[PDB]
Amino acid sequence: GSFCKVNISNPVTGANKSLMIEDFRKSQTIHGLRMASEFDGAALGEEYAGCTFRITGGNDAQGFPMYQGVLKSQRARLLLRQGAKCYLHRRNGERKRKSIRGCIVGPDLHALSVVLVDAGDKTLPGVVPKRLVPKRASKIRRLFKKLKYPKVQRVVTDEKYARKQRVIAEKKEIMRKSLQQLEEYKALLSRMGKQHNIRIY
Amino acid sequence: MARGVRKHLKRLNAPKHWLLDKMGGIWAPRPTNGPHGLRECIPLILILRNRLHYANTYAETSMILQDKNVLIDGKPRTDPTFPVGFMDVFEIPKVHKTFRVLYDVKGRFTLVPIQSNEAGFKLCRVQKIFLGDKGMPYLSTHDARTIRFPHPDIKTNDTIKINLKTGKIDEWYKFDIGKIVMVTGGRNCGRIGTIQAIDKHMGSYTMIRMKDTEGTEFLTRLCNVFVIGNDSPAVAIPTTKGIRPDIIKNRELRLRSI
Amino acid sequence: GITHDKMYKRSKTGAVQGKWHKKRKYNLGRQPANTKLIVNEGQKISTIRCRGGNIKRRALRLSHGSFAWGSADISHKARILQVVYNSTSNELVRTNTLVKGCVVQIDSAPFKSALSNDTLDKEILDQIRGDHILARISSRPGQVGTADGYILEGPELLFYQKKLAPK
RNA sequence: GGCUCAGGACAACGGUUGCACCCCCCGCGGCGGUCCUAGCCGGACACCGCUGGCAACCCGGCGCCAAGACGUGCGCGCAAGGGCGGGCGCCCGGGCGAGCAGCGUGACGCAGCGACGGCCCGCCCGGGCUUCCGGGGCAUCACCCGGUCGGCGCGGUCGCGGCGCGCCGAGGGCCCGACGCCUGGCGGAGAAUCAGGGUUCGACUCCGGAGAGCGGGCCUGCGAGACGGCCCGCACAUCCAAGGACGGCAGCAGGCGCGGAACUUGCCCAAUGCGCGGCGCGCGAGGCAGCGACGGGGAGCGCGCGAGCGAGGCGGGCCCACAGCCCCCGCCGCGGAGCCGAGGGCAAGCUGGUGCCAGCAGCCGCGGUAAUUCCAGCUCGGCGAGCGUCGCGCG
Ligand SMILES: [Mg+2]
Ligand SMILES: [Mg+2]
Ligand SMILES: [Mg+2]
Ligand SMILES: [Mg+2]
Ligand SMILES: [Mg+2]
Ligand SMILES: [Mg+2]
Ligand SMILES: [Mg+2]
Ligand SMILES: [Mg+2]
DSSP states (O other): OOOEEEEEEETTTTEEEEEEEOOSTGGGGTTTOOTTOEEEGGGSTTTOTTOEEEEEEEEESSOOOBOSTTOOSSOEEEEEOTTOTTOOOSSTTOOEEEEEBOSSOOTTEEEEEEEEEEOOSSOOOOOOOOSSOOOBHHHHHHOOOOOOOOOOBSOOOHHHHHHHHHHHHHHHHHHHHHHHHHHHHHHSOTTSOOOOOOOOO | OOSSOOOOOBSTTSOGGGOOOTTSOSBOOOOOSSSSOSTTOEEHHHHHHHTSOOOSSHHHHHHHHHTTOOEETTEEOOOTTOEEOTTEEEEEGGGTEEEEEEEOTTSOEEEEEOOSTTSSEEEEEEEEOOBOGGGOBEEEETTSOEEESOOTTOOTTOEEEEETTTOOEEEEEOOOTTOEEEEOSGGGTTOEEEEEEEEEOTTSOEEEEEEOTTSOEEEEEGGGEEEOSSSSOSSOOOSSOSOOOOHHHHHHHHHHHO | OOBOOGGGSBOTTSOBOOOOSOOOSTTBOOOOOOOEEOOOOSOEEEEEEOGGGOEEEEEEEEOEEEEEETTTTEEEEEEEEEEEEOSSOHHHHHHTBOOTTOEEEEESHHHHTSOSSSOOOHHHHHHHHSSEEEEEEOSOTTTSSOOOEEEOOTHHHHHHHHHHSOO
């Protein structure tokens, strides 16, 4: 086929939408652009003019993803490490060699991932609902059938204080007993030499 | 050449004094690391299943151990493969049975029931005196127990009495001629005798000669000579006072029991 | 890859021995660090994960080290100027490569800062009045990541002086 | 853990030493002083919602959230390494047979632990190398080696070491058999045979070694030069909606080829054990069953003048994870011998055919009109649910 599945996502409001393109002359300006490259929407006169877009990724005709730093218009193979994009590991330290499409944009693409950073005054079909709420104590403190709520974390109740105090006391008494044992052993051996590391300070 | 440590144990390759049956199964329990090594120990399950007969299978022994019904030196142990060794304390409070693990004349592990007056301690053999971190003197024992700041008068191959409740020394027995000993390895395991000579060969093993009370004399190397008190034993010993009978006498005993 | 196994060598009689197993990781080796005197620039040291999880560090570039004057018991931290002699090869000297046993020149400022007047070993005082002092390296860079040493004196000082004087 | 024996012949391997040249997870016992917001710190991803490419395999972009995860870090000076600190012929404690450890002091360096405290030490199992002895055949293989032998210095290694590099000198091994070549060469504990002394074998149950199509390389991890882990070349092989993707049964069953020769594509974790765990899960390890004249052991096809007894059939127990089988209790009741040979070695003889033909015969030999030996009937002999034929080993 000869098209491009342009997917648009709005991060300020959490809304995304998709559409189709049936030409290249229109996208010639899009050609030769890399990721994180500003692309004005005036190319699309259908309520996208004057809006600044950012290219974030896409999939070539065969489906191979796009990698940032290759700097190429065709796909290539490299040895992918752990934690890298476009690779799911199975063993802890395993690698894999697989193909990926180049970062530079070209006609061979079939899907384009773009984001909106700055637009004009006109509003477009493309509020952010929050399916979850902060769970850490610091987060919530900064910010403000059945009843289901998240369990709070990082809260220091009574028993945490008792545990910490007990641990501190245990360590202190351990050190005190060791000091006493060293003192009594040193008091002994009055008739022999000794060689231990003297505590400094 | 195996790439790592071994975890299994074939039944035929197991120690002889365990007395495992040839056709019981392909495998045998593999004791885990602990106070005693593989060749001078015995797994707990063997005692709990093939000796006292309190359990008929692995699962029963595991359940019993999880319920914490067995104490080893006052500390409950939940491992079915925990290694038990010489001069241990084996008390089961729920049935008021307390035993001490020792060697019989035939050279096998045995349980000697004991009293409460002497069940709160154990005897340990000191094998090493070394300086640890900061130059602090230390000592180690045959049961993998390290003590700090010991008395200078204690030397190697001595015997130490440590209280189980706390783990502190109370008295020690010097290694010398005329002290009752017990043999813990070799062809003479389980015998009791008194040291008569100590012959040291430079750069090689030291040989110890002891005489049995009846008058018999035998030799063994110092690596498996265990002092168990002065003149008289400090702890209880099996009914026979470490006297190994001859084949003819043993056959007479067998016929009498038949 | 690199190995120190003896299975690839000949026997004492000169015969060739057969290869009866593949390569093992017990007997591996690694490329030399080739620590370089400094003379995107700075001290660089790398860490190596050795057998058993132990950590070994090889220095690739360094410029300073601790040097001790044993006779007077004076130890300071000094800057290494350049290598002047090596008993293994002249190529190491030309490249200014640091290894154990190298003879180097260190700055005299830390040692002339004091005791330039005290009546000590005369042969060292004359060096102190100058700008550089002959020294030797005692540590192993490539294993510990340091280049420490001591100030020469006695017969060895005369030996090295005679060695590097006619040049 | 399981499979197999290709490779490899002062090697592997067996017994006997050592590390004062070494590393070590779990577990057990100790130990626990850390220089310069602590009513408790910071940011992310996974799953998931929205949106999409691609034949499949695979993944993309945006978006709020957790930690016994990651990062930073409150804390009584402490990691590695480095300089100095004993003698006057030898011998007569922390510790040794053995100047080995630890410590003090002068300089460097701030490693590890710490948002529910463990860095470190000892033991243990295991590994790495190492001393002495043993360790196939061919002399139509008699001279061989040139990092090959030793010394000095550095590097690398967990660590010693020609292990590697530079310089120096020349050496090392051999008829007490070097070097070279060959092996239908894994080794031992052991197996076959049998007066005693010995000969042959040793794929396979236990131990040790090596390998996962051939040859190499590597990440993770205490531990792998791992292959039911990844990368490359070579040789094979599979899907393709032709642009692409993808595999390693010398694991259990099963299939092809090969050969003289070798079993079910079954049930179960109930027993023995391993892994992770509190009242259990998983395991083609292992167990049960099926085929099975490799082979070993025990009974029988009658006794006596009437009875009795099996095999077998039908039910009930016991056993079994469930089913069998054995064994026990009731009713009814199939008794079936073959393979070799009859001249000698070697125990066992009468008729009819054929006529040096057909055939027998390990050897001697028979057969050309009685054939004691061929082909048949009768009779007889040996072993017997087994007998005979072919090859190998011992005798
Ligand atoms: Mg600090
Ligand atoms: Mg943390
Ligand atoms: Mg072979
Ligand atoms: Mg094996
Ligand atoms: Mg392998
Ligand atoms: Mg491999
Ligand atoms: Mg495997
Ligand atoms: Mg496979």
